[PDB]
Design a protein around this ligand. Structure first.
Ligand SMILES: *[C@@H]1O[C@H](CO)[C@@H](O[C@@H]2O[C@H](CO)[C@@H](O[C@@H]3O[C@H](CO)[C@@H](O)[C@H](O[C@H]4O[C@H](CO)[C@@H](O)[C@H](O)[C@@H]4O)[C@@H]3O)[C@H](O)[C@H]2NC(C)=O)[C@H](O)[C@H]1NC(C)=O
Ligand SMILES: *[C@@H]1O[C@H](CO)[C@@H](O[C@@H]2O[C@H](CO)[C@@H](O[C@@H]3O[C@H](CO)[C@@H](O)[C@H](O[C@H]4O[C@H](CO)[C@@H](O)[C@H](O)[C@@H]4O)[C@@H]3O)[C@H](O)[C@H]2NC(C)=O)[C@H](O)[C@H]1NC(C)=O
Ligand SMILES: *[C@@H]1O[C@H](CO)[C@@H](O[C@@H]2O[C@H](CO)[C@@H](O)[C@H](O)[C@H]2NC(C)=O)[C@H](O)[C@H]1NC(C)=O
Ligand SMILES: *[C@@H]1O[C@H](CO)[C@@H](O[C@@H]2O[C@H](CO)[C@@H](O)[C@H](O)[C@H]2NC(C)=O)[C@H](O)[C@H]1NC(C)=O
Ligand SMILES: *[C@@H]1O[C@H](CO)[C@@H](O[C@@H]2O[C@H](CO)[C@@H](O)[C@H](O)[C@H]2NC(C)=O)[C@H](O)[C@H]1NC(C)=O
Ligand SMILES: *[C@@H]1O[C@H](CO)[C@@H](O[C@@H]2O[C@H](CO)[C@@H](O)[C@H](O)[C@H]2NC(C)=O)[C@H](O)[C@H]1NC(C)=O
Ligand SMILES: *[C@@H]1O[C@H](CO)[C@@H](O[C@@H]2O[C@H](CO)[C@@H](O)[C@H](O)[C@H]2NC(C)=O)[C@H](O)[C@H]1NC(C)=O
Ligand SMILES: *[C@@H]1O[C@H](CO)[C@@H](O[C@@H]2O[C@H](CO)[C@@H](O)[C@H](O)[C@H]2NC(C)=O)[C@H](O)[C@H]1NC(C)=O
Ligand SMILES: O=C(N[C@@H](CCCCNC(=O)c1ccc(I)cc1)C(=O)O)NC1(C(=O)O)CC1
Ligand SMILES: O=C(N[C@@H](CCCCNC(=O)c1ccc(I)cc1)C(=O)O)NC1(C(=O)O)CC1
Ligand SMILES: *[C@@H]1O[C@H](CO)[C@@H](O)[C@H](O)[C@H]1NC(C)=O
Ligand SMILES: *[C@@H]1O[C@H](CO)[C@@H](O)[C@H](O)[C@H]1NC(C)=O
Ligand SMILES: *[C@@H]1O[C@H](CO)[C@@H](O)[C@H](O)[C@H]1NC(C)=O
Ligand SMILES: *[C@@H]1O[C@H](CO)[C@@H](O)[C@H](O)[C@H]1NC(C)=O
Ligand SMILES: *[C@@H]1O[C@H](CO)[C@@H](O)[C@H](O)[C@H]1NC(C)=O
Ligand SMILES: *[C@@H]1O[C@H](CO)[C@@H](O)[C@H](O)[C@H]1NC(C)=O
Ligand SMILES: [Ca+2]
Ligand SMILES: [Ca+2]
Ligand SMILES: [Cl-]
Ligand SMILES: [Cl-]
Ligand SMILES: [Zn+2]
Ligand SMILES: [Zn+2]
Ligand SMILES: [Zn+2]
Ligand SMILES: [Zn+2]
Lengths: 694, 694
């Protein structure tokens, strides 16, 4: 038989291991020849595996690279102008790869050029609340200073945006051992911790979903009109560079001015974590000088797009996509995900060769330039938006399959909650102590839902990965799943070797997943979801699960507003419309579910499948969110303070944020009321798509 | 049998006559009690006629009305400040209606209040080119003057926008006998010409598709957040008032300053048509003073929405809609259209009572507040946009069925050209001299296509009626058809009694259509289109007809650009991408048509019907046109100089318009190139929706 069990049994840990090794022997940086060769290899193999069509879709996008003959570095400079300390020009390469060339040195992609020189101020994680504390409570002025911030907690682009609006003339990012060195584990190559010379790469854009900075709204094809660099979307205005904790120690150790305000501002280095500005007495004449010479350049990128045509609904698309480009070797990010995708394609192709096809079309994607701002997935979605709008059932992301080995982590639309619960109950747990138990049981034990006893945690989607365009711009139901660590406070920080040269095959095989059993479990979860989405007669979405979360989100936003009861009285700020809409959605969803359970008629089926598919689409406002036209989903958007985190009712949340500091409270509360109307209207409109059609 | 012939034979001229009489005995001004009572009557009757559901959808929108106890008028005022001449406070009412009350006096809806006083300048039709002639050639400065313009040629809102940007402090609109008095015909009540006391009402908004000025993007429902009046969309900033030619004569006869520049500036009154500014010698101290006291107020409006549920595809909607609100009696506009819609509903209901249902759902709409800026249709479409987006097959408008008795006039998407040709070949011509001949034959003889021998003219859609939101914002295939006059130069001016108190039942029955045969023909065309759209197994759209017009439109925009060959060389302005896209669209459309002709499989059918339905949708850019976010169709938009006229490739057209006067030609030509890319991309994207789906 050709059923989900046949699909799942065909997946093999040893194949995923073979593929990971094959994908991680040389760097695959976006825009380079190596990454083009890998794209060509994957295209050839996906054809061999049995896909109906496999094409490269290429775009010419803005990328960023250091200048090979003019290296980026930071100095402490004396009053004569002698550079008495320099940060490293590269990470010491891992054992056996000290002869690989084309390892890109650590840099912050898209930093402008400059050589700013100034006094340091330490801004903790450079979060919105850290800047509030500095400026409002400590009365420390960041204007004209170089800010030094530790990585962690929030997306680095948000740190740089925050520093820029504080008036900083430069940003130094570093990895503190508090966030990137787990106690009791050894540094690479003898354990999975970050060495003092390790550095986290990463882009510092604030694109807000735009894709290629030069072509917002339209694909960067051969005849594209490009904005000038001055009008480009999302580029930082001040230079930025990342360093490791050996170099950070040298910069922080001389810091003077104010004591840190409390212990949450102290990392693990042997320094005072003084906030500054500037150095203590004897060194008060020394300054810090950045030297940044990276260049932005329009460069070709290549997505691999594979098609497995549906037997019954070939005009309905289930998409499994993840990126292929890496900072260096990509041992976890992304090749641990890409190796899983390759084995999933191989398994679907095996069934295809035996005569089977899925009910709906499955599209497989190997995205390029994800590391430079989700460019490959976004450009392809801009090119194909009309097809995706009208035909896209679901998108399942597939970046890193593991970031730890403790338990499952899932983020998805509420429409997939029931699907994920049902699938994990049929999968075997790979965890020690749970042999013979289901993945649902181990996951629920290790990661309990905060609200429901006997259910696991599933988080909201935000951004920071290639599902963003599909879910936040186009309103296609999306999900993702991976194996994760225990470390709750580190959930947005990355694992210790994230975006460093030390993310290698050896890291994964020695320290994360030697038997590839966690990889296999994740291939079963991602592959299983795609199989059910592409083959179930009725789409496996439960609208009642959206009704449940919409009430939670409404209660939550109401509670935030109710921190200001006098203003709510004065400006007559009522949430009645929004609760009414959510109540209506609950009632209509309940009636729709009854009809779905109670209807031989393929028109009623497909009419009902169309109602299910277009339900996520109904949450899209074609006018977008305020000043963020490419974030259009009214229930979910990436947090304005942390692109990695999902925020619920983001239009209302942002209207309420820091509202007590607004100078015209009448205008500010007016805008809260406007967002309440938009949200109530959209919830009601979405509910009405589930009513009887005529 | 229940086929189109059964539907068509059930339509009766005498019923349309009965209904027109019933709809025109009292005024039905938007927002008034009379118009609410008519809405209730129509709802009751549509239920009686056999519709499955008939509901009122109400909204609270900004309307505008004169102040009943402080009338609007214009004066000539002497240097003492004595008002020596006053324009009329009302039109002499027609015979037998001199005792109807609640006849709203002539006014320009949405004019602000004011009493500006100044010198007159005569600006012909106040078109963009008339203002260019005045300002650039004649060097006449409109700043601080009152402009007097004749109605005709372009939408009056565009006249007022043009006057405002010229710096006018007021606008007087009048009907010149050259445009509104056909030679050799008598004035009402003895013929269909405009009397000297007749006045054309009408709104002067520039909404650009927004709908209710206070709630752009969202329906004006009970919890809607409204903009303040200062931020309202589309309101004029200077007072405006319309007058008849007896009053115009008194204002124009004293005009001095420059002679008219040529004969195209002279109307038919016994005046010099001097441009001004100001009056001749002896009267040079007299001024003109406007007195405008109208008020804008949020007022409830009611649409009637009737549903006839489809037997096989109830989730696919064919919409027949037209408005019900009128300036006064609405004898032609809109009741001649509404009476036809009522008889169409009656005929479909008769077949329904015999057990028949259409394949797809048919929705019938009686829109309110069309006269105040398409408010009723736009608010309902904003409320229902997700349903319409995903389920709307076509929209057929039904305002005035007659504006003359010479021949048919059709404007529609190219997707309906073949449908209209085929239907008119099966209908009998009602014209004298064509008895026993088809409507196609009479229409083609009287209104030949400019490009094709043996085919009739069909025009583009622009705006100025309730199809605008469906076609220009949502991308639903739309069409309209009516009987028209011979008068080519008057095609945007209206018939003589347009928007005057003299548009009565007697006007239609005595002078336009005494046997209601032209009304019946139009009911057969509109009703026939709706029947075919709702019942044909394959949607009756021919994508190859779009490919033909896209080439014409590309040749046309290329030719406009080629008036500037040196700039095209300098800035490398190439149309190659756009021609390539159109060539591709032609090829793919041809292959799609072959497959459509060559496929028992309802999935392939409905997949193919979905490709046909979503083809118009593919021309929508979700980013809208520049500064016009609610005009989203890339091929068609209402002309920026005349809302009534359709413009093709409007983004490129507007980028090229008057480009030689732009101060930064590099920037201006950059923007032309950007619009060429957007258009080429969208044409290719639309073509790709017709490719094989996987
Ligand atoms: C959730 O679904 C329910 C439907 O089950 C839906 O209820 C609707 O609520 C609206 C607004 O609350 C009702 O609107 C009323 O409609 C009547 C005519 O039917 C009008 O006469 C009412 O207007 C008068 O009263 C107003 C309120 O005080 C005044 O402001 C106004 O000036 C008038 O005097 C009023 O518009 C509507 O009838 C119901 N529909 C029903 C019960 O079927 C509700 O709106 C949905 N929630 C959301 C957020 O959409
Ligand atoms: C109409 O449909 C046709 C398809 O039948 C489609 O043709 C496509 O045109 C594009 C752009 O013209 C082609 O793009 C080329 O792709 C190859 C790889 O396949 C690249 O190597 C090419 O890049 C080189 O050459 C460029 C042009 O001089 C340089 O700018 C560049 O730096 C490289 O050196 C180039 O990108 C594409 O292959 C075809 N596809 C085909 C033939 O199947 C056409 O684009 C459609 N028209 C529109 C408006 O969409
Ligand atoms: C990764 O695996 C691929 C596929 O087996 C290897 O590419 C093949 O290399 C062999 C031997 O040189 C050639 O004969 C084939 O043409 C290649 N097949 C392709 C590209 O589809 C590749 O060499 C392996 N890479 C590494 C780094 O081990
Ligand atoms: C840090 O790096 C800088 C740049 O290479 C070093 O300063 C240079 O030293 C060379 C050789 O002495 C001089 O010729 C250059 O003029 C210097 N350049 C600048 C910009 O100062 C510096 O020696 C290094 N500092 C340390 C402590 O190693
Ligand atoms: C997850 O599994 C549950 C339990 O099997 C499914 O719920 C059942 O679905 C069938 C078919 O509609 C019903 O007859 C049962 O009453 C349901 N049981 C319940 C609600 O407890 C549920 O549909 C599955 N979710 C999916 C497939 O998304
Ligand atoms: C227009 O026609 C309607 C429908 O026949 C008339 O309304 C009816 O009036 C009669 C006699 O007063 C009542 O018994 C019915 O209740 C009405 N039916 C409705 C409203 O559905 C209406 O009076 C006619 N109007 C004019 C101006 O002739
Ligand atoms: C035009 O209308 C105005 C306003 O009604 C007339 O002027 C008024 O005349 C009355 C009676 O003589 C005076 O009490 C008012 O003070 C006048 N008002 C203003 C604003 O001037 C005027 O007589 C009319 N002109 C003509 C020629 O009929
Ligand atoms: C208009 O009528 C023409 C002529 O009947 C239709 O074109 C024919 O359609 C059938 C069915 O696909 C074909 O077998 C014939 O070859 C067509 N004749 C032609 C192209 O000359 C056309 O489909 C009708 N248009 C509609 C219904 O939109
Ligand atoms: O590196 C990126 N993404 C990694 C970032 C990991 C760090 C934060 N992790 C999460 O937000 C996360 C949330 C849910 C799941 I299931 C997994 C990871 C990823 O999404 O795997 N994205 C970019 C980035 O520079 O941040 C390259 C764009
Ligand atoms: O009055 C309006 N519409 C009439 C306007 C008639 C004058 C210009 N005529 C056309 O643009 C026209 C084009 C195609 C067809 I088929 C019929 C008329 C109508 O569309 O019947 N619309 C408004 C207006 O004030 O202009 C009320 C909004
Ligand atoms: C990189 O630096 C070198 C050496 O100083 C310089 O010649 C070249 O212009 C730079 N390359 C760039 C900016 O791409
Ligand atoms: C910070 O410093 C600059 C001057 O160096 C000044 O313009 C700015 O207003 C200061 N900001 C605050 C909040 O003190
Ligand atoms: C894998 O799990 C084991 C067992 O608890 C643990 O000791 C090891 O540190 C884990 N690896 C990682 C990277 O968390
Ligand atoms: C209309 O004019 C009257 C009489 O001068 C005035 O009292 C009233 O305020 C006005 N009505 C309005 C502005 O709605
Ligand atoms: C028209 O008149 C006003 C002054 O009354 C002046 O400001 C404006 O610039 C003039 N415009 C032209 C084009 O002469
Ligand atoms: C109706 O047609 C007749 C015959 O040509 C013509 O004399 C009459 O003026 C027409 N009515 C209108 C309003 O055009
Ligand atoms: Ca782009
Ligand atoms: Ca609105
Ligand atoms: Cl992922
Ligand atoms: Cl019409
Ligand atoms: Zn990644
Ligand atoms: Zn990454
Ligand atoms: Zn009308
Ligand atoms: Zn009208």
């Amino acid at each position: 038989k050709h059923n989900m069990k046949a699909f799942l049994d065909e997946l093999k840990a040893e194949n995923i291991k073979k593929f990971l090794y094959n994908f991680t022997q040389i760097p695959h940086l976006a825009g380079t020849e190596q990454n083009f060769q890998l794209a060509k290899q994957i295209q050839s193999q996906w054809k061999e595996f049995g896909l109906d069509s496999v094409e490269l879709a290429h775009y010419d996008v803005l990328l960023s690279y250091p200048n090979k003959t003019h290296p980026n570095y930071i100095s402490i400079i004396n009053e004569d102008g002698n550079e008495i300390f320099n940060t490293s020009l590269f990470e010491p390469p891992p054992p056996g790869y000290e002869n690989v060339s084309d390892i890109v040195p650590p840099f912050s992609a898209f930093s402008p050029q400059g050589m700013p020189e100034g006094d340091l101020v330490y801004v903790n994680y450079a979060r919105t609340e850290d800047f509030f504390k500095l400026e409002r409570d400590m009365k420390i002025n960041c204007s004209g200073k170089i800010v030094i911030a530790r990585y962690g907690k929030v997306f680095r682009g948000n740190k740089v945006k925050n520093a820029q609006l504080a008036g900083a003339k430069g940003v130094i990012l570093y990895s503190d051992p508090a966030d990137y060195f787990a106690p009791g584990v050894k540094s690479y190559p003898d354990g999975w911790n970050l060495p003092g010379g390790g550095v986290q790469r990463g882009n510092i854009l604030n694109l807000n979903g735009a894709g290629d900075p030069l072509t917002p709204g339209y694909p960067a094809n051969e005849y594209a009109y490009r904005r000038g660099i001055a009008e480009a979307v999302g580029l930082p205005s001040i230079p930025v560079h990342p360093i490791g904790y050996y170099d950070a120690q040298k910069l922080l150790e001389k810091m003077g001015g104010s004591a840190p305000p409390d212990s949450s501002w102290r990392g693990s280095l042997k320094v005072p974590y003084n906030v500054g500005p500037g150095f203590t007495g004897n060194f008060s004449t020394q300054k810090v000088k950045m030297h940044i010479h990276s260049t932005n350049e329009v460069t070709r990128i290549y997505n691999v797009i594979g098609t497995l045509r549906g037997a019954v609904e070939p005009d309905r698309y289930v998409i499994l996509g993840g990126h292929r480009d890496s900072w260096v070797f990509g041992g976890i990010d992304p090749q641990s995900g890409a190796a899983v995708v390759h084995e999933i394609v191989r398994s679907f192709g095996t069934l295809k060769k035996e005569g089977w096809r899925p009910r709906r079309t499955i599209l497989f994607a190997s995205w390029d330039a994800e590391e430079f701002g989700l460019l490959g997935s976004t450009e392809w979605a801009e090119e194909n938006s009309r097809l995706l709008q009208e035909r896209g059932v679901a998108y399942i992301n597939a970046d890193s399959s593991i970031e730890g080995n403790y338990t499952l982590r899932v983020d998805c639309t509420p429409l997939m909650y029931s699907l994920v619960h049902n699938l994990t109950k049929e999968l075997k747990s790979p965890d020690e102590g749970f042999e013979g138990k289901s993945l649902y049981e181990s996951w629920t034990k290790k990661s309990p839902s905060p609200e429901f006893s006997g259910m696991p945690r599933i988080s909201k989607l935000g951004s920071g990965n290639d599902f963003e365009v599909f879910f936040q711009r186009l309103g296609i139901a999306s999900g993702r799943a991976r194996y994760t660590k225990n470390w709750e406070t580190n959930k947005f920080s990355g694992y210790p070797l994230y975006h460093s040269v030390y993310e290698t095959y050896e890291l994964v095989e020695k320290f994360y997943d030697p038997m590839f059993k966690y990889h296999l479990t994740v291939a079963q979860v991602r592959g299983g979801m795609v199989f059910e989405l592409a083959n179930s007669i009725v789409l496996p979405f439960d609208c009642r699960d959206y009704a449940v979360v919409l009430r939670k989100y409404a209660d939550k936003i109401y509670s935030i507003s109710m921190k200001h009861p006098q203003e709510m009285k004065t400006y007559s700020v009522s949430f009645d419309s929004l609760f009414s809409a959510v109540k209506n959605f609950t009632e209509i969803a309940s009636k729709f579910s009854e009809r779905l359970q109670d209807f031989s008629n393929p028109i009623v089926l497909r009419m009902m499948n169309d109602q299910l598919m277009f339900l996520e689409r109904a949450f899209i406002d074609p006018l977008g969110l305020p000043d963020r036209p490419f974030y259009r989903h009214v229930i979910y958007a990436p947090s304005s303070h942390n692109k990695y985190a999902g925020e619920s009712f983001p239009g209302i949340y942002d209207a309420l944020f820091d509202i007590e500091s607004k100078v015209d409270p009448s205008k500010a509360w007016g805008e809260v009321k406007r967002q309440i109307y938009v949200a109530a209207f959209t919830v009601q409109a979405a509910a009405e798509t589930l009513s009887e059609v005529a």
